[PDB]
């Protein structure tokens, strides 16, 4: 879960902890770094779940939904559009099951699309005076919403039931704390009725 990557490590469409990534980039590997455009956290507009337009490539002018975002290489994978074909089930006597597989796209290769007219548009991050902070289109001036995407938790909160080891909301939020000038040790000692009468004595710290 906590693995540190080498200073010049290639992000390669597979998670760093994956077996395929371990095969591709063993610790012995050293290769020339790919240099990417520096983009801050406050101007990256396209998020995982919105519809983008491919400006050029093998298919130019077709609309698609991003399925994965790799911020370490300015990559957005569009669902089944900028694809090349490969086999997955491989044996020494029979191989087949040719599938389409997407190739990553740089962020200049795609543009955001607004739901009114379904056209490519540029986005500027205009800070709303209501408190929240969202994107705004340039040509027409609409609020393009952050798309709803399933979270990385792999769960849906509405169809969630408490397990035998999950504490319920009521007794997990019920406030039993009363602030006091006593330590946890004193509180547990007195609560469990442990009587200590002999005193701790002077000790030399140095």
């Amino acid at each position: 879960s906590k693995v540190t990557l080498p200073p010049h490590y290639r992000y390669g469409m597979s998670p760093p902890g994956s077996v395929a990534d371990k095969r591709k980039n063993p610790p012995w590997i050293r290769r020339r770094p790919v240099v990417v455009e520096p983009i801050s956290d406050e101007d990256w507009y396209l998020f995982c779940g919105d519809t983008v337009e491919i400006l050029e490539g093998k298919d130019a002018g077709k609309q698609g939904k991003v399925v994965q975002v790799i911020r370490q290489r300015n990559w957005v994978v569009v669902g089944g559009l900028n694809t090349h074909y490969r086999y997955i089930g491989k044996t020494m006597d029979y191989r087949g099951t040719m599938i389409p597989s997407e190739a990553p796209l740089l962020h200049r290769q795609v543009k955001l699309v607004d739901p009114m007219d379904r056209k490519p548009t540029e986005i500027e991050w205009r800070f709303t005076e209501a408190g929240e902070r969202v994107r705004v289109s340039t040509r027409s001036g609409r609020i393009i919403p952050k798309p709803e995407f399933p979270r990385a938790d792999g769960i849906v909160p509405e169809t969630w039931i408490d397990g035998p080891k999950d504490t319920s909301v009521e007794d997990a939020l019920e406030r039993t704390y009363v602030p006091c000038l006593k330590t946890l040790q004193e509180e547990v000692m007195e609560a469990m009725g442990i009587k200590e009468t002999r005193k701790y004595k002077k000790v030399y710290w140095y």
Binding site: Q68, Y87, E102
Partner: protein
């Protein structure tokens, strides 16, 4: 006098994306036929207009 060989390679694909991922492989086709169309046994004999 201390050097070995390298390039341990495996030449078989596997099912590693379903092992852990938040994106899926986007398919374009199906496995077989929803229901096989049985042709008439005497289709060659009935290759005319109609009977």
């Amino acid at each position: 006098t201390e050097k070995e060989f390298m390039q341990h390679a495996r030449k078989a694909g596997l099912v590693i994306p379903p092992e852990k991922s938040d994106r899926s492989i986007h398919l374009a086709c199906t496995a077989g036929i929803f229901d096989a169309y049985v042709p008439p046994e005497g289709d060659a004999r009935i290759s005319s207009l109609s009977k």
